[PDB]
């Protein structure tokens, strides 16, 4: 087809010129080839790549956005590294700095005084104003946004604004005469530093800058404690907490490619080489990162020092992050659409059986709950990081991952405090207590014990789940030191594993044989119920489930014909000490305690989200007005759709509102250790966006 050439896209003749000098110097080293094509602008180049006339182009965050849309749908494949090696920066945070001691929170900037870096800049305007669109009263595109922010702050310094159309935006500007409010250095309250000094001097109440500013311009480490940042969950925290209190992380420029047949391989080969040899301080004959005397950042930024391969799970939407992604969409969207969308709760359903239930739920929510879906739990997480979905209930194993991703716990799934017991009218404030992970076996083989389970057949709820995987595989690991999970057992049914492995050997997919090993309801051997079924159907010898699982699938508690005649007495539990115990004794024969499933979300959605659930609960929870009349939120019965079936109510966290706190330190430490052997596409992705 098309030569082992990567075809680079240029936006200027100058750029085209550097390209050609690239092409020739790559030929001279018998390095990977690069062709060059020239267009007049970034979109022309986005168009080119998408119509197959070019392969890559490096873009800034606003173009990464445009490029990810239809009809282009390109993707970031390599990121520019700035700084110095050892001081490598892949991004910065867009923060709202205010001085110590106020009671105003982001929700309340109304009527205050603002200091911005400059009209249409990322951190001084796009992010902040996009973030605040909800409050502006601003009809929309067009009426000029400027008209509404001028009506929201009582005064700002917005360099570059029209002091003739919006005098207010320039009133705190410190420039003399006509310089006043200039998008230049002639204006002292211009860019990061002018905007911060604007605060510093007492002219404005809030400065919208980048995190580094605060650091690089504050001398001691003492008048730095005189400062504070505003968080999107309407809190305030100190300036070194920017990794947890920021309006947006703005990513470094990235080399974008086609999401389908993008030559990403080719592209990274080219780049890695381009870099070893024509790097920074690498050769006098050519410099990838360098521009000819009256030119700036041709092809790459002249300040870049290298590139970072962006994990394949990243999207333009994941690349920008929710803060930045939603800021850009808000500034485009009608006011009614913004309205609607902050009111609605978009649930993320994993699988079609879960979407059926959601839909049903959505129907009766009196408009407050809507549904989105994905095929996997990581995919739902990624839809909430993109702001496309808002919540879902997750196992603690995925609470860690969504937490590494910046998501937070909101409410926990409360279970009844022990095997047989009564309803607590105060379920919502009762502290969560966890649940027990067990290893259940069929009573027939007498010789099977915890000490001989190695080498047999296992049934797991899914990979990365607590009772189904982390605990059993963590235990075994402790014992053997081996990271070779697929050699612990002969054959297994472990949804979410490699379809070609022994780990997926016992899965049976759906009625037709498809969806084998997918980690959703379509796999009949998926979850608590499916891993139990895997044991009961004698596909595997041990099932890693919770103690309640046996109870809900035996003695007729489960209707399904495979389950119908099962008897509790037909199962035993494998205790850590080698004994076998009846199922009613999980209290003294369990593998470990696992944290309750938790509803997670984005900080920007937490108060709206509790409010809709508390309220949805009241109508459809365990003792609720319309349950079972119309719909029961916590019933599917042995189905476990959206929520576990033994959920009494959704309950408060008791300040345990960070994945770290909610799971607690021994849980964290254990999983951390395990992720060493292997990770996941999304943990990977999130580790990269946070590095
Ligand atoms: Cl599980």
From Swiss-Prot:
Spans annotated as Bactericidal and antifungal activity: 2-10, 20-30
Stretch list, region Interaction with PspA: 20-27, 38-39
Enzyme class of the recorded protein, top EC level: hydrolase
Stretches assigned to the Transferrin-like domain: 6-333, 345-676
Function as written in the Swiss-Prot or TrEMBL entry: Transferrins are iron binding transport proteins which can bind two Fe(3+) ions in association with the binding of an anion, usually bicarbonate.
Enzyme Commission code(s) on record: 3.4.21.-
Keywords assigned by UniProt, alphabetized: Antibiotic, Antimicrobial, Cytoplasm, Disulfide bond, DNA-binding, Glycoprotein, Heparin-binding, Hydrolase, Immunity, Ion transport, Iron, Iron transport, Isopeptide bond, Metal-binding, Nucleus, Osteogenesis, Protease, Repeat, Secreted, Serine protease, Signal, Transcription, Transcription regulation, Transport, Ubl conjugation
Single GO term (MF): lipopolysaccharide binding
Residues annotated for hydrogencarbonate 2 binding in this entry: 461, 465, 467-468
Tissue: High levels are found in saliva and tears, intermediate levels in serum and plasma, and low levels in urine. In kidney, detected in the distal collecting tubules in the medulla but not in the cortical region or in blood vessels. Detected in peripheral blood neutrophils (at protein level). Isoform 1 and isoform DeltaLf are expressed in breast, prostate, spleen, pancreas, kidney, small intestine, lung, skeletal muscle, uterus, thymus and fetal liver. Isoform 1 is expressed in brain, testis and peripheral blood leukocytes; isoform DeltaLf is barely detectable in these tissues.
Cross-referenced Gene3D superfamilies: Periplasmic binding protein-like II (3.40.190.10)
Residues of this chain annotated as glycosylated in UniProt: 137, 478, 623
Residues of the active site: 73, 259
UniProt modification remark: Poly-N-acetyllactosaminic carbohydrate moiety seems to be needed for TLR4 activation.
Top-level taxonomic group: Eukaryota
Top-level taxonomy: Eukaryota, Metazoa, Chordata, Craniata, Vertebrata
Assembly and binders: Monomer. Found in a complex with LTF, CLU, EPPIN and SEMG1. Found in a complex with MPO and LTF; interacts directly with CP, allows Fe(3+) incorporation into LTF and activation of CP ferroxidase activity.
GO biological process: antibacterial humoral response; antifungal humoral response; antimicrobial humoral immune response mediated by antimicrobial peptide; bone morphogenesis; defense response to Gram-negative bacterium; humoral immune response; innate immune response in mucosa; iron ion transport
Biological source species: Homo sapiens
Database matches in InterPro entries: Lactotransferrin, Transferrin, Transferrin-like_dom, Transferrin_Fe_BS
Site feature Interaction with PspA, where: 4, 13
Recorded family membership: Belongs to the transferrin family.
Region: Involved in glycosaminoglycan binding, residue numbers: 27-32
Region: Important for full bactericidal and antifungal activities, residue numbers: 2-3
The protein's name in its UniProt record: Lactotransferrin
Residues annotated as binding Fe(3+) 1: 60, 92, 192, 253
CDD domains given in the database record: PBP2_transferrin_C (cd13617), PBP2_transferrin_N (cd13618)
